[PDB]
Every structure is written in structure tokens, then in C-alpha cells.
Design a binder for these strands. Structure first.
Ligand SMILES: [Zn+2]
Length: 269
DNA sequence: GCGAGAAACAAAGA
DNA sequence: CTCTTTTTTCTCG
């Protein structure tokens, strides 16, 4: 998932599991708990979920007064809320069991991660990750963004994917944003003029906020599967279809190892 | 520091 | 059968 999908999951979880006491925690794939599964089980069993936050693509469970469970879903991690008697599915790895149901984490590629840290360690954790600002008018300062772009010869797509200029874009929304802002994904950032940087800045915020409002892009039933943003995608996965602005065919290339969808007319090299 | 390429892993498709 | 394709963080040179 990307930021809008993780936000959607966060909202659904906030509505449903906040106030629940964790009765037990079980793992078939304990190795995805990076801080140690048996340790997490000992610390969190019997604790109550107080809240669910998000930073970039990271989900943050607030559990008891002092614990933060940082969850990253990577490529295809999925959470679902199930009855206590629900049958195991092949790629289920972890479950948090409550009195009346269970939260199950599944991940076909086993990329997703859980790390248990303390409340006062959350800010240092994200500073160490070098995550940039949230994609909002309030947090995402255009002036710093512009100065970072001016100083770099990186290509704009890979630089945006780093999470350091702004948090939350993955392959789908970065392609969508660059199409919206009329910028070629291989454009060296020090070549971008002030007005293009402005349009890029605003387009990042607009696309991600629209995606959130629409409940994410659900591509292929787990939490956040009721999204509608996929119906608004202009380029990602649209190879051979026509650009909605100009009518040229959307092309797909490879940029820094990633599949990259763009309009060659609207996004001049 | 940089960019290229690839691994962690599994499945699906050519 | 092989090769390619689908978030983060590493090694390599
Ligand atoms: Zn176009």
C-alpha cells in the first residue's frame, strides 16, 4: 500500500479496535517482529489499545500508556478483522486476539514488519529513518522542498520515492503526481523551475488528500478494500490507453528499476 | 557521498 | 524450464 491506503486502514482500525484489551497474540511467522516476537507477546498481552496513528506509510498502534507498535505493510501487507473461529489463510502471519474477534496480519511476500518501541522513542525512530514531512499544506514546506530540489542532480521520480522530500508517495501516486504536475520522471531536480516546483508541491498534497478522501486505491477483502481512488488513476497501469488531457498514448518505461507510466506529450523530457 | 542493481519473498504471466 | 514483474535498505565499485 501507499500512504492513502495506510491512512484508510488507520481510520478503520481507530473506529473498531480502540478500547480493546488484547487477550493473546499468536504468530506463525514470528520473524517479522523485528524487536522479537516472544518479547512483544509478553509486553502487550493484557494491554488495551488506546489509539492508532500513522507517520508516512507506517502504522502506529498506541497500546497501554508506554508502548508503540510500528507496523509497515510494505508491498502487500493486509489487515483484517475476523471472528475468533476464523480459519487460517495461507499467508496469515500474526494475530492479535480480542474478546470478540481478532486482528490478523497477512503478507504474501513476508516483507512487512512489526517493531515494538516506547512512546518516547517514536520521534527518534522516525528521525533515524529520515522520513520527510507529511503531505499537507501545514507540514510540507514548499521553500525547503524547492531548495532541496535545487541542490540535487537526482531524477525527480526516484528522489520523490526516497520519502525524504515528503512522506507517502509510492510507485502509483508518484506516477500520478508527476503526470498531474506535467513533469517527466527522469527530470533532474536542479532543472525544475520555481513554477513547476510549486505545481509539483501542490499536486503531491492534492493527489494524496483526494486518495485519502476516496478511501485509497484498492487494486485487487481486508481493511481498506472499499477504496475508489483506483477509478481516478490517470496513468498508473494505463499503458496504451489515452492521456485524458491530450489524447496521446500512455507509455511505460523503467526508471531506476521501477515501472514508470507517463504521457510523453504532457511530460516533456 | 553517488547510482545500479539486487535482496528480503511469493506468485503470476510471457 | 527461464526471465520478468510487482517498499525499504543493503552492497558494490
Ligand atoms: Zn497528455
Amino acid at each position: 500500500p501507499e500512504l492513502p491506503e495506510v491512512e484508510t486502514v488507520r481510520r478503520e482500525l481507530e473506529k473498531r479496535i480502540v478500547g480493546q484489551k488484547i487477550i493473546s497474540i499468536e504468530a506463525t511467522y514470528p520473524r517479522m517482529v523485528l524487536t522479537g516476537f516472544e518479547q512483544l507477546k509478553k509486553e502487550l498481552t493484557g494491554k488495551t489499545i488506546q489509539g492508532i496513528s500513522r507517520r508516512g506509510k507506517y502504522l502506529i498502534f498506541e497500546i497501554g500508556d508506554d508502548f508503540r507498535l510500528i507496523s509497515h505493510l510494505r508491498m502487500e501487507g493486509k489487515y483484517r478483522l475476523a471472528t475468533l473461529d476464523a480459519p487460517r489463510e495461507k499467508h496469515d502471519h500474526l494475530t492479535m486476539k480480542f474478546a470478540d474477534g481478532q486482528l490478523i496480519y497477512a503478507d504474501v511476500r513476508k516483507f512487512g514488519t512489526w517493531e515494538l518501541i516506547s512512546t518516547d522513542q517514536v520521534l527518534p525512530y522516525f528521525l533515524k529513518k529520515k522520513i520527510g514531512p507529511e503531505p499537507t499544506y501545514e507540514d510540507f514546506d514548499e521553500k525547503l522542498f524547492r531548495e532541496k530540489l535545487r541542490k540535487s542532480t537526482k531524477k525527480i521520480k526516484p528522489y520523490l520515492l526516497e520519502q525524504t522530500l515528503v512522506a507517502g508517495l509510492g510507485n502509483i501516486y508518484v506516477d500520478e503526481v508527476l503526470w498531474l504536475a506535467k513533469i517527466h520522471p527522469e527530470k533532474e531536480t536542479n532543472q525544475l523551475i520555481e513554477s513547476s516546483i510549486h505545481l509539483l508541491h501542490d499536486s503531491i498534497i492534492e493527489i494524496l488528500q483526494k486518495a485519502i478522501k476516496l478511501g485509497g486505491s484498492s487494486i485487487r477483502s481486508a481493511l481498506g478494500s472499499t477504496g475508489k481512488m483506483q477509478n481516478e488513476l490517470q496513468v498508473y497501469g494505463k499503458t496504451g490507453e489515452k492521456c485524458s488531457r491530450c489524447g496521446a498514448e500512455i507509455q511505460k518505461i523503467k526508471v531506476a528499476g521501477r515501472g514508470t507510466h507517463f504521457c510523453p506529450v504532457c511530460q516533456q523530457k
